[PDB]
Amino acid sequence: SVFLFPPKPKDTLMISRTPEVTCVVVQFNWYVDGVEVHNAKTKPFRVVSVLTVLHQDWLNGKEYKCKVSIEKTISKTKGQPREPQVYTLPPSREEMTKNQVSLTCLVKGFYPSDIAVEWESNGQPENNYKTTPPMLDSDGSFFLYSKLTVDKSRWQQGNVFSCSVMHEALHNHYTQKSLSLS
Amino acid sequence: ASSVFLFPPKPKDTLMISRTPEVTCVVVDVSAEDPEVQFNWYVDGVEVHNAKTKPREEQFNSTFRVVSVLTVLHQDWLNGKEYKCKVSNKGLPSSIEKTISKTKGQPREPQVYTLPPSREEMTKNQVSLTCLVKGFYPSDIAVEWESNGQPENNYKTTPPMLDSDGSFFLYSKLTVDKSRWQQGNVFSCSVMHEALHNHYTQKSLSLS
Ligand SMILES: *[C@@H]1O[C@H](CO[C@@H]2O[C@@H](C)[C@@H](O)[C@@H](O)[C@@H]2O)[C@@H](O[C@@H]2O[C@H](CO)[C@@H](O[C@@H]3O[C@H](CO[C@H]4O[C@H](CO)[C@@H](O)[C@H](O)[C@@H]4O[C@@H]4O[C@H](CO)[C@@H](O)[C@H](O)[C@H]4NC(C)=O)[C@@H](O)[C@H](O[C@H]4O[C@H](CO)[C@@H](O)[C@H](O)[C@@H]4O)[C@@H]3O)[C@H](O)[C@H]2NC(C)=O)[C@H](O)[C@H]1NC(C)=O
């Protein structure tokens, strides 16, 4: 049997990273848009072959075919890309009876579902956050929420937190939205 | 050969006394060349005879599927009784059994917070009203929205997700026309969970 895996979403969106398609057999011929390419790297039973893809090729829907000597074909999810709308929501006043409070990042209206969300403060990643998997909304687009938990003191003292979102339909494939007491 | 799957009642059914919770035992990969599929059901090891077993149904992969459904009492389920479905073939000694009960662990009461739309969303025709539900255990929960006495339909609720402290959280997002929000209408996020007093709480929000 043969299995073919796409690049990691982040690798396709950031030019500093190198996206790859992975062919796993549990000899290789690789094709991009039916044209044979010869730059894949094959590690010496499980056999793995890895093809580096160009960012623009992948995002532009080119098809990647792995032929083992059985054939598999993969490409980016199809459908009109839609820009994530990113909104930061402060903790409820009612949550202030607790020692920790919840900072919320709502990300909605995006397509495809491939996305990365992180929370930070002072340019450093926050340790305590969790993000819901994207979920289908009424209009066929996706939403999610990322919940950052912080000591209440850090919130009350006016510290600035930021929700970072990486998606293909954003300018520079990246946006940051701030959240602090105001 | 056969595979048996045993499903718990829906959380809304266990938490609302007027609803009827049930456990469902499903047998797949049944061959019609084998003897009749038989179900024996047990509550805390004691055999019960009130299950309703459906006729077998041919599937589109040269197999049959057979379902048996057992009504459960609300207090029995909530008190942690164990429900065993034992599947066998008439005249053969071998069997497959599955057991299910309410998730074990110290129950923890959900904290429920309502969050208005971001100022930045107010440039759209529709806005998002958020209900954060956190700190709960077990994950079994029901969340709904109402306004002016009536259910609000246009919401989506994320599945419970494990938080860093072993409890669960979710968010429910209600989409409303901005004019409805702007004119002062009160919206209510309703939550049903075993660890709440009366298995019920509601939190409201409106423009203020
Ligand atoms: C022959 O066909 C059988 C019937 O399938 C139907 O017909 C065929 C021809 C196809 O067209 C199918 O697409 C079609 O569905 C197959 O039966 C299936 O067998 C598999 C096991 O091989 C079962 O998988 C198990 O599914 C569990 C979840 O099941 C719920 O959710 C399903 C997916 O959404 C849904 O289809 C099911 O009906 C079921 O729905 C629940 O029903 C209960 C009771 O009625 C309700 O109260 C719930 O609300 C319903 N839930 C939802 C979400 O709607 C999984 O939990 C389970 O995973 C667990 O076990 C495995 C180990 O087995 C672990 O690895 C895993 O980690 C986890 O612990 C598992 O995936 C499937 O349910 C069966 N389908 C039906 C309809 O009964 C046969 O397999 C096939 N035979 C062969 C040889 O091919």
Side-chain angles (χ1 to χ4, degrees), chain A residues 1-26 28-40 42 44 46-66 68 72-182, chain B residues 1-118 120-208:
Chain A
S1 54
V2 186
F3 301 94
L4 193 59
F5 306 93
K8 300 295 193 307
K10 265 184 139 184
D11 296 343
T12 70
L13 303 178
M14 291 295 109
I15 199 58
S16 58
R17 296 166 74 129
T18 301
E20 312 165 314
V21 167
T22 308
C23 200
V24 181
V25 191
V26 291
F28 292 83
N29 303 107
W30 286 90
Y31 310 94
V32 189
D33 278 350
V35 179
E36 205 181 333
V37 303
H38 304 270
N39 62 299
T42 314
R46 193 166 176 270
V47 195
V48 184
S49 177
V50 169
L51 186 77
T52 294
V53 306
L54 299 171
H55 293 82
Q56 60 268 43
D57 284 357
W58 179 263
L59 290 178
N60 246 295
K62 288 201 175 189
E63 285 186 342
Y64 296 85
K65 196 165 82 199
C66 180
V68 188
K72 302 277 271 220
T73 306
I74 197 143
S75 43
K76 193 181 75 87
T77 295
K78 300 195 198 189
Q80 176 96 329
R82 296 165 75 180
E83 188 185 346
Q85 300 159 227
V86 188
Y87 306 113
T88 55
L89 313 174
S92 161
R93 170 68 64 252
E94 306 309 305
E95 202 179 17
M96 303 298 167
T97 57
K98 314 285 175 175
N99 293 328
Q100 298 200 287
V101 300
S102 303
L103 314 213
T104 301
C105 190
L106 166 58
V107 187
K108 63 112 85 192
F110 63 95
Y111 193 94
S113 75
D114 307 287
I115 201 159
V117 175
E118 285 171 60
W119 270 101
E120 68 175 54
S121 190
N122 306 309
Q124 254 78 229
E126 286 292 312
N127 181 256
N128 199 4
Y129 71 92
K130 295 295 178 193
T131 307
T132 69
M135 188 181 175
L136 214 42
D137 227 339
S138 321
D139 60 6
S141 77
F142 290 87
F143 78 100
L144 64 73
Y145 284 94
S146 190
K147 183 172 62 72
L148 167 63
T149 299
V150 302
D151 289 344
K152 185 177 55 184
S153 64
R154 298 176 67 208
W155 176 253
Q156 283 174 335
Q157 294 168 359
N159 296 10
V160 186
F161 301 91
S162 172
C163 181
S164 291
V165 180
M166 282 182 41
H167 189 266
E168 70 168 283
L170 289 163
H171 181 255
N172 297 147
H173 298 157
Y174 201 74
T175 193
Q176 295 174 95
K177 299 298 174 178
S178 288
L179 183 59
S180 55
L181 223 165
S182 58
Chain B
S2 287
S3 283
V4 178
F5 299 92
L6 180 60
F7 299 91
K10 295 291 177 293
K12 204 164 160 188
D13 292 344
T14 68
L15 300 168
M16 290 182 54
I17 202 67
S18 59
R19 288 176 67 113
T20 61
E22 300 164 328
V23 165
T24 308
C25 191
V26 180
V27 188
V28 295
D29 291 346
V30 171
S31 168
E33 297 298 337
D34 294 318
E36 176 195 333
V37 170
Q38 298 194 129
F39 289 89
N40 298 86
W41 279 93
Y42 303 89
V43 177
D44 278 349
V46 176
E47 196 174 2
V48 296
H49 292 277
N50 61 313
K52 293 195 262 177
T53 299
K54 299 165 170 145
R56 70 183 187 187
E57 290 176 5
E58 194 181 4
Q59 303 300 298
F60 284 97
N61 61 5
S62 308
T63 71
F64 283 74
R65 175 176 177 278
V66 198
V67 177
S68 191
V69 183
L70 178 65
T71 297
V72 304
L73 301 180
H74 295 79
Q75 213 80 104
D76 286 359
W77 180 261
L78 290 173
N79 279 345
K81 295 203 176 182
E82 300 195 340
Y83 295 89
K84 173 157 65 183
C85 178
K86 182 179 77 175
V87 177
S88 64
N89 296 274
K90 191 174 180 205
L92 292 175
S94 175
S95 63
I96 296 156
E97 68 181 49
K98 291 286 189 285
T99 298
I100 196 153
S101 55
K102 196 181 77 58
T103 302
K104 297 179 172 75
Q106 232 321 110
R108 297 162 64 178
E109 179 178 53
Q111 300 161 225
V112 182
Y113 304 112
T114 54
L115 320 172
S118 152
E120 290 84 68
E121 201 181 19
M122 302 299 276
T123 71
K124 310 278 174 186
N125 308 320
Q126 296 199 290
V127 292
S128 297
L129 304 182
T130 297
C131 192
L132 166 59
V133 191
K134 72 162 283 187
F136 63 95
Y137 193 95
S139 68
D140 303 79
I141 196 163
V143 181
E144 297 178 340
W145 286 88
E146 301 164 3
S147 185
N148 303 319
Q150 293 304 310
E152 289 286 317
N153 67 280
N154 200 10
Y155 63 89
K156 293 289 193 168
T157 303
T158 68
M161 195 181 158
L162 199 58
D163 217 334
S164 56
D165 73 348
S167 73
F168 289 88
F169 79 95
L170 58 73
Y171 285 90
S172 185
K173 178 173 68 68
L174 169 68
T175 302
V176 302
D177 291 330
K178 180 177 64 207
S179 59
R180 285 181 75 208
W181 178 248
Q182 288 185 317
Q183 69 189 201
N185 284 331
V186 175
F187 295 88
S188 305
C189 172
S190 279
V191 178
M192 284 187 283
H193 190 271
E194 77 163 275
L196 291 164
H197 187 253
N198 289 150
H199 297 157
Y200 180 91
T201 197
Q202 205 177 47
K203 299 300 166 174
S204 294
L205 92 157
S206 60
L207 199 143
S208 53

